[PDB]
Symmetry: D3
């Protein structure tokens, strides 16, 4: 057991999907995992382990923010033998052509945070995902007939940022989506030798100002989850 | 209802106690509040509103890290008329003379986060608590015969910091406790026009390594909650 | 004798009031101290030690700017056993509701100086005053029927700042007064193990431009000195 | 015609291969392209356009350092309609498990340069390559029986860096190779909406300097060019 | 009259020598100027105007630190028609070969301060003296048979710096002397269109740890002053 | 022989002239030096040694950007005993009173590069030329009836800077010319104990782009070389 996870080695699979919302983890466990057992509830950060098409898989919330997901992923990698982490969340759109229900894969992640600079002698550390995991995700989305956009995400420390001019910048440099963990998770993965990937569905559009709500929205969220789950299956083969 | 809180203007008191852990907010509602009523459960961030010796009070977790509490404190302040936020949590100590279970009042909060620099044109913004709130807490503590140090806290972005030596710097400058929120909450308070104070219980020494133990946790934690609740009363008078 | 103070251990009281202007230190010695004795004149930075209602007190100018007062406060603390430093000066206001002659207590001090970043590994060090000293001053002020705001000051390196807009940022974050020392004095206090507090008289509005006028200066200045001197008494009791 | 490219729109292909040394550009043109025609001589930075298996392609040296290649890549993107830039060169390794002559694909590029911060409001921009180009290169390498590693490169501003401890950091964070352009080219591509990729062959090892014959170097360099060239064909399919 | 100088246009010469110590200004006025009249005493910062070999010359203290000298030089340049400022002070040695009684001329000045970054969009502004003034100084020293070293000075914000490793750095890059104003004065000169120069005599040796005291020491200080005075005479011709 | 210079100690003179474009190096050698012998061909960066009025002198292109010239200047200083480096090239002007073909001597060089901060503990290093070399160049220019301006140059990392407002800043602070190497060469020279100078001729004007005939350009370029060459002779005297 670690400070934020009350479980023991073996309780988690070597791969863990991680949404920001713990309630979302329970939703993933019951919707896609068979024989899912809760392996953690500390601070209400629900974690589950089960199987997908016979493969052992875990899913657990990481809370909101780089500081939050950093603790959890680190504890998973160094104390529970987790070798892969796939964040599955929502991001805000900045690019006009990126429509809602578009699955976004963060090959890289820009950031507002100072954590990677702390780690990298105040230089620029390019926070990137594991290449194979990105490829597995793209191929899985393909097999499912889903159009995935691979590019840069932006991990912000302030969901309510005082600088709105930054969004024009993110747009100029092609940032595909804005969220709050990717850069943090990739920094932890590189620091402790594991692999990570972040997948997002666009729920908000800071461009055309139009969030999402319909059966269609929830269908895209599940597609993302399937992409994540199927991508690990391809990784095993 | 805001993006992370499903409640309506009026569901919250004008003062809100906030621990990091949502499960603690619940325990506080059940232990110190009468007519406890759950006003939010989005993302499992349990929020309660009740009464303490006649005063309307609210208690809701804020999650871990500056990005997490910044979201909640902001939404409470701008959409629920919350005037005062009182963070009640745990912190690690760096000063040898600061022993476990000690109660620390964060008059100020240092940080390695970039949030305030982003707000303050990259200059040094002194993240400070509201003076009256600090004084109220100091007084409530004396009335309860409890010792309470007043000074600087350090809000870290990385619980698992790769910069060990920074703790020597914290010690040299008198940091009373190491946590992960104060500086963010104080930043938001100044930005959105509210008042805040962070009270922390010394859960361990970053040096010695002695995580919370036995039933000591409850007494001290209850003392902190007692100090914060009473301080709110002295504040009204 | 230190490099900038020709005095000997014992020439100074354990508490020292310090205005920026050396000529003010003299006026204070003559006006409020009995048995006033000049203990330093190096670089014309007049220093005095006398008695106030029986208490041994010292008053010496610290010059203008963080680099200047850092030198003096440091030498007093490390070579003359000075335990408490109380800066008593003037400040420009940025908040419309803060009017001229207002008395401000710097609980905290923001700055655009790099001194604290150099001390704090380039992180954010919250330059704060000693809590008891702030409280003593707030009380001394009430006993004198004087209004005194408590909050953040901004210590600027450039009196003639080429960044006008920064004042809007100061206003937005509630800076009560703009001066040029607080943050440095608080930094030195933490570094060398002493206590400090900065009290300022609002000499004008950075906006309106209304430099000190008539005999109002003397009354208010004397009120500030009265508040600082009395605060030292409440401190001993 | 631009400040450093004396040619007209159409003279270059929509895809440009760029070696560090200009001499290599002429070699590439006469060794792998057919019907090559010179298109630029300014500053001795030779430029060539021709075909590889029917595909129109251009090659030209980009010089050493982020500033040099930023000039050329920018002009090609905005004035000659270039859509893809592939830098082909050498790099030094810091990882023991990375051998000389190993082919490294830079999915991302870290850097100690300020060009990206100046572009990104002083935040962390993750300088990444175009994902499809990365996979094309990996698949082309596989088809040619060549082993290819994908990950981070480090673009140094100083070949003779005053800091030797930084190499330990690079190793700790998995940097595959050290060179001097990638982060700059990726920044430029992002700024002007184009795609870029950097492929390097491990020339030396900052570790234990091994040894390679001019013959072995020849083979490796041609493998890198074929990879690059075949990757372009895969991209078209 | 300006906020820190109680004088009127004409009271100062268009050239002003400035030592840090106001008492030193009086020493210069009486030792080298004929018919010297005090033109300022605000805050005890003595200023004088007289003639040297028939030329109108002024001398005035600037206090200690960039923040201090910035105010004074700015007020002199923009309100008293001063076109030239020559700081004449003392500096600490860092280079072994730079002996005591060596006259140092700061063609440039490095710094710890953030003031020039505030002015220069956070970039590197090379704080330099006016070339002609440097040349006049070198020629004047020559005519007097004095060996002047021209190079870089280092303007520190902290006379008592917490980082001693910086001195090795200053030494590695050939900094000839350490003081506290040059960089500030050069920033003001460039900002308001005037010319400045800083001349120093080495009084302390942070290398061999040996200050200076003798008739010889005071002879070198006067040589520096003569150099400054004679250099302006050459400037007029 | 070094990584970028295939020559041996003695092949170069203790003084090296460096133009941006390598083609210019061959021109300088056959137009102003006698008995010239090639000493380097690596990467097409031609090197030559010979004599000018009996004085041994070398010339070789340094490429574009701080990173490029830093490599070459460092190797020449540490491996070929070079004592003086004179960069001769062009620059863009931002000051209206600075006309095309004007000769500019860089006593100092500002920059937006991080190389000097990385070298100087993140402080402001004033990248300055060797004073004697500056005066030699000014005197040589005078002797040749050429007008020469002395002051700051700005070494940009990005020829195509995203910020256009910075040019206003440069103008406000008197920058005489914009180029891309000076600050880097001065940094290197300071690091390895050598002397450097940068001389530029105003090629274009970021203001109103005027016009110059290839003939006028020829004349101006030769004037700059003579200046440089004659300045070396003056330095020897
Ligand atoms: C609109 C917005 N801004 C910042 N971070 C976000 N994550 C999701 N949506 C976001
Ligand atoms: C090491 C550390 N960092 C931040 N918050 C903490 N609480 C307890 N220990 C902590
Ligand atoms: C503009 C300004 N800056 C710093 N200190 C001051 N006191 C009065 N006005 C001031
Ligand atoms: C140390 C270093 N820096 C930059 N590029 C390189 N290629 C090989 N070694 C290198
Ligand atoms: C020793 C020392 N350190 C820092 N600044 C100084 N000015 C003069 N002497 C000095
Ligand atoms: C804009 C710019 N940047 C860098 N070097 C230059 N030479 C001429 N113009 C230039």
């Amino acid at each position: 057991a670690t400070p934020h996870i009350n479980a023991e080695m073996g309780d988690f699979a070597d791969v863990v999907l991680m949404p920001g919302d713990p309630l979302r983890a329970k939703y993933i466990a019951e919707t896609f995992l068979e024989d899912a057992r809760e392996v953690n509830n500390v601070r209400g950060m629900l974690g589950f382990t089960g199987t997908y098409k016979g493969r052992k898989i875990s899913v657990m919330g990481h809370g909101m923010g780089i500081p939050s997901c950093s603790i959890y992923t680190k504890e998973l990698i160094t104390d529970f033998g987790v070798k892969k982490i796939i964040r599955v969340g929502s991001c805000g759109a900045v690019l006009p052509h990126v429509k809602l229900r578009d699955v976004v894969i963060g090959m890289g992640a820009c950031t507002d945070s100072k954590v990677n600079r702390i780690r990298f002698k105040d230089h620029d550390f390019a926070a990137i995902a594991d290449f194979d995991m990105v490829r597995n995700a793209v191929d899985a989305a393909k097999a499912l007939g889903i159009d995935a956009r691979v590019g840069n995400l932006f991990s912000a420390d302030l969901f309510y940022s005082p600088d709105g001019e930054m969004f024009d910048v993110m747009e100029k440099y092609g940032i595909l989506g804005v969220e709050m963990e990717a850069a943090g998770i990739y920094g932890v993965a590189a620091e402790f030798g594991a692999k990570a990937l972040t997948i997002c569905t666009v729920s908000d559009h800071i461009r055309t100002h139009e969030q999402t709500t319909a059966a269609e929205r929830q269908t895209t969220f599940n597609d993302m989850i399937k992409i994540a789950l199927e991508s690990v299956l391809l990784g095993d083969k």
